[PDB]
Amino acid sequence: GVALGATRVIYPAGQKQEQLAVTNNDENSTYLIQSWVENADGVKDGRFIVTPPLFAMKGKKENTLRILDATNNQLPQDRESLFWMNVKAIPSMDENTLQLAIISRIKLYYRPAKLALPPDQAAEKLRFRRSANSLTLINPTPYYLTVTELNAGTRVLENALVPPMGESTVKLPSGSNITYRTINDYGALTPKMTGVM
């Protein structure tokens, strides 16, 4: 039963390392743990180093992964960059069976040091434009917005990941009153916010 200490990692520009806990809650199971970082394209990026990239957990254990900035200061400095932290748990072996490795994937936001807007004010700047048969979420802020519990009047819409100074586009069932929550840096749901399409 391998788990992670967070659902996302905020990496502030300037830090030599970032830490993420990995655990196994099962005394009976033994796991090989393989970890790596991918970009927004799902391509294995050498821009963030994880140590140990490979290690073993024989039973109930906790190990701390170290996430290292190897970006050579080449990422954008006016917005967050999206990366994906990948942690694969490979179980020790055993009659007709299916056996599974488990990949936990969590967001890794590289966050530059001098953004004007405080992260806590970002979610309230989200704008919604109506098209023909769709709804476009407009993000004017430098932060990735994970939008969830999106409602248009009475109908419940799909969840969206709206990129900084960019946009995302869900489908509409065809109300004007919009409600939505987002997930903060601590992986917690914000209260209900209202919008206008």
Partner: protein
Amino acid sequence: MNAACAVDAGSVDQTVQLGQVRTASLAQEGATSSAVGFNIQLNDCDTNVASKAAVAFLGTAIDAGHTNVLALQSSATNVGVQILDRTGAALTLDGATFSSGTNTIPFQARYFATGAATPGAANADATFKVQYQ
């Protein structure tokens, strides 16, 4: 404050028991066996973290014709394993087919024949992908 989930298929080492391969039920291509149920557990986490997650599978297809039929590990042949959702619907193995008791994800598994199945044991591997919101 919120941690990810402790993932568990089966009871130990992510190991799921399959039924036996009866060749007389899998005599032709397209033939399927009975489906065994299994659960994947997302433990030790907030119930809104677990439910709001997007899950997918990833494995080697049996052939190009059957991309949702998982191959075997040699030793029965002409047959692989297929993974179904809660109600009996096959799922992909390309690792890009999401999306979303407590914190249980119910699945089924069954054998998909690609021809006259030869007797032998069926042991299959795959990877389960949990991606958090």
